[PDB]
């Protein structure tokens with residue numbers, strides 16, 4: 001009569017956060033199976049959009065409408081960028097890098113390429129320079145509950161005039177209130193964290209910082225990186241971040257093993 | 259007086275396909291520099307959208323509106339998928355794979371994960387099953403004029419009813435006429451190529467094919483893969499595909515080394 005742990009795990013895979021003892025496993029499972037197939041049928045009949053693609057489109061519109069230039073830069077980057085970011089073997093991230101070939105890696109962050117664009121664009125664009133990128137990033141991780149090895153970052157930045165902590169907090173606040181995500185900014189160049197409960201949604205920086213010089217910067221700047229799968233996890237109340245990932249196993253949080 | 263080859267290369271970097279002897283290099287270069295900065299200024303002032311992100315959004319809308327479910331699946335995939343696609347050391351692609359770790363690689367195509375979704379979705383969705391994905395793909399290449407090692411694929415597919423060569427050609431035709439790209443379908447399970455002059459835009463398949471069985475398929479299907487950077491190259495008349503790539507060196511076809 002009591003469900004086994006295995007049976008409970010199985011049912012939890014099929015449980016949407018929205019769902020609301022007695023019946024056997026086969027019955028509980030059968031109920032959940034037809035609910036999930038119905039959810040997928042409804043997606044297919046109406047909207048047809050993937051959550052992660054749709055979030056990316058919504059965030060792009062948010063930033064484009066606020067004067068930020070949309071960037072798409074390489075995902076496979078020179079290994080030299082990692083060192084140049086100050087990620088020496090004395091840091092946590094140095095062990096988390098997926099290397100490709102002798103000279104390349106999968107980007108673990110958007111910073112290097114956005115530094116390069118800020119430098120280059122300063123030669124062409126009026127002050128302030130406002131840019132952002134959304135795209136895949138990669139880190140080896142132990143955790144599986146709040147972490148993915150393949151994830152998606154948003155990074156926005158501004159360089160020149162108006163690069164204040166007040167302006168930075170205001171962008172973050174307008175951003176998260178637009179998405180409808182509850183948050184807290186925590187802090188004391190300047191570095192702050194945007195938290196949902198104990199989940200880190202973003203880390204943000206008020207520059208200048210000494211690293212800028214390695215990238216040829218020399219102007220004040222503000223910026224923040226957010227993980228889109230964490231935003232989805234929070235917004236859709238997914239218990240595990242795997243429901244928000246690029247995946248063959250979940251589609252918009254619905255199990256595909258039906 | 260005659261421009262050197264180096265000087266000509268430099269000026270060609272700054273030449274947009276749209277542009278229209280006597281003056282020295284410094285003058286020619288200076289003219290082109292202020293034109294390119296002006297192009298970037300105009301992008302920044304008005305639209306702010308990256309070509310590759312914008313093309314992806316336009317193609318997504320095209321397919322979503324035609325009843326295709328939007329998929330986002332992993333870019334880092336099991337190495338076993340490559341073998342399972344029938345890419346043995348007797349093929350060209352086997353040498354083109356970027357391996358990561360012992361067990362992984364960067365996807366060189368979208369097929370494996372879309373096979374997996376067609377199988378899984380058949381258990382939930384009504385006939386026909388219509389899906390697509392747009393995203394990064396990776397192959398080691400010698401060529402640099404029509405090829406990128408980091409590129410972006412669109413793959414759409416349909417499985418079940420209506421999986422005919424006529425329907426396949428019609429989707430392709432409506433698709434490319436929508437984008438405004440000139441093409442020719444060339445062919446004779448069934449395999450056709452969509453060509454722009456001598457440039458291959460797409461390869462398309464009318465299934466079933468014997469490979470399907472390895473992926474648990476067993477239904478008729480149609481599908482095609484297009485490279486988005488080739489579509490941009492053709493549409494914007496870029497002479498080299500690097501102008502259409504994720505890049506620190508070009509933005510919407512405009513040199514960032516100004």
Ligand SMILES: Nc1ncnc2c1ncn2[C@@H]1O[C@H](COP(=O)(O)OP(=O)(O)NP(=O)(O)O)[C@@H](O)[C@H]1O
Pocket residue numbers: 109139141146147148149150151152153200201202203225226227228229230
């Ligand atoms: N492995 C991951 N999976 C999903 N999101 C991630 C992952 N790593 C980082 N992020 C997101 O990227 C944002 C900025 O990156 P960063 O500040 O470098 O992360 P971090 O400091 O390693 N955070 P954490 O590992 O939770 O302590 C983070 O706040 C997360 O939202």
Ligand SMILES: Nc1ncnc2c1ncn2[C@@H]1O[C@H](COP(=O)(O)OP(=O)(O)NP(=O)(O)O)[C@@H](O)[C@H]1O
Pocket residue numbers: 367397399404405406407408409410411458459460461483484485486487488
């Ligand atoms: N390296 C690349 N760079 C840009 N686009 C590519 C690249 N490789 C493949 N594609 C695109 O993906 C589409 C389908 O992939 P596929 O049919 O496997 O390419 P292919 O047969 O290797 N074509 P090619 O190498 O030009 O002879 C191709 O028609 C191209 O539009």
Ligand SMILES: [Mg+2]
Pocket residue numbers: none
């Ligand atoms: Mg971390």
Ligand SMILES: [Mg+2]
Pocket residue numbers: 200202203
């Ligand atoms: Mg952090």
Ligand SMILES: [Mg+2]
Pocket residue numbers: none
């Ligand atoms: Mg090839």
Ligand SMILES: [Mg+2]
Pocket residue numbers: 458460461
């Ligand atoms: Mg081909």
